[PDB]
């Protein structure tokens with residue numbers, strides 16, 4: 052596994068012990084062989100669970116999710132997938148790790164795809180070894196993998212709106228349910244319906260994940276309503292998963308705007324990870340998995356793989372060479388390697404728009420490639436009338452940094468900046484020059 056030029060896919064079933072049993076064994080062996088090693092966690096919650104599994108081993112935690120006093124002699128670093136890609140993009144020196152371990156390697160956010168691309172390229176070059184840990188590698192077609200204990204799988208119509216009748220099985224249950232919804236707005240409606248029926252509901256999404264996930268441990272709950280972020284190693288003490296089997300798909304139209312298409316079917320890998328939240332206790336057989344649709348290969352033409360190419364085109368590898376996507380996921384995007392490579396100043400703007408600006412990769416690239424500087428927000432107001440962002444059925448308005456009230460009408464429209472109330476609030480602050 053640890054030899055140069057080797058990439059191993061550790062694909063044991065969900066709950067088989069990849070993170071808590073296998074990972075410490077690999078790390079102990081890497082330390083014995085003096086391999087400079089990186090361990091990539093998908094989220095801060097996983098980074099904290101990894102410190103518990105690796106306690107006693109000399110690991111440098113490059114995350115504020117863990118409060119540890121680092122000796123300075125560690126040769127094993129642990130950080131999130133996003134932090135690894137961010138440090139590669141920034142002028143900072145990232146060590147040339149001999150062994151690269153990615154946990155929850157199925158993560159399809161642009162920074163995780165780019166991290167796989169870079170690492171797999173280094174392995175192909177003969178410079179490093181890598182281990183990708185996931186039950187569902189790219190292209191898997193099995194939505195029903197093995198589990199620690201038998202699961203009751205039932206195809207059933209699942210509500211995606213508030214309901215008054217016809218779904219008694221949903222509320223008649225007396226255990227704990229994790230329910231996967233296609234979007235934050237859809238979860239808000241279902242959570243309100245369940246709360247009105249007397250249930251205790253916790254909601255999780257990317258922006259609220261670390262904070263709200265703690266509530267699943269600190270208080271009693273009946274339902275967790277979550278987007279796809281809970282496919283990335285989130286553990287619950289639940290006995291049922293309700294799975295809409297739907298997700299939103301960012302799609303670039305005519306190379307000039309991004310829409311959130313769908314809801315549409317999830318991939319088999321997503322379905323297997325959603326189901327994989329339950330059936331984890333060998334002493335509790337009969338956990339239920341209720342699913343409301345089929346799977347499809349909705350990662351084909353999905354914006355995240357084009358965004359991963361934008362990030363890889365702007366990471367130094369060697370001279371003018373550019374890292375390729377990891378081979379099993381390299382056909383998801385029609386893209387030319389190097390087409391998004393930016394000159395030094397525009398690249399710095401692109402990075403700052405993602406890091407400080409908190410903009411989606413595609414949108415950050417359109418602004419930087421137009422030669423616009425980070426603090427110049429005129430583009431948030433000079434788009435066509437059809438790019439007007441709406442707030443409760445009327446044009447959204449902001450006071451510009453000049454003190455003028457203006458309608459929010461970006462030159463490039465990316466639906467992700469206004470997909471929910473929190474996203475629109477953050478984009479309004481950006482349009483106003485507040486960060």
Ligand SMILES: CN1CCN(C(=O)Nc2ccc(F)cc2)CC1
Nearest residue numbers: 133134136137162405409410411
């Ligand atoms: C609304 N989102 C929040 C998270 N986000 C991000 O994770 N970007 C990023 C891109 C590249 C990279 F390498 C690391 C992070 C910015 C936009």
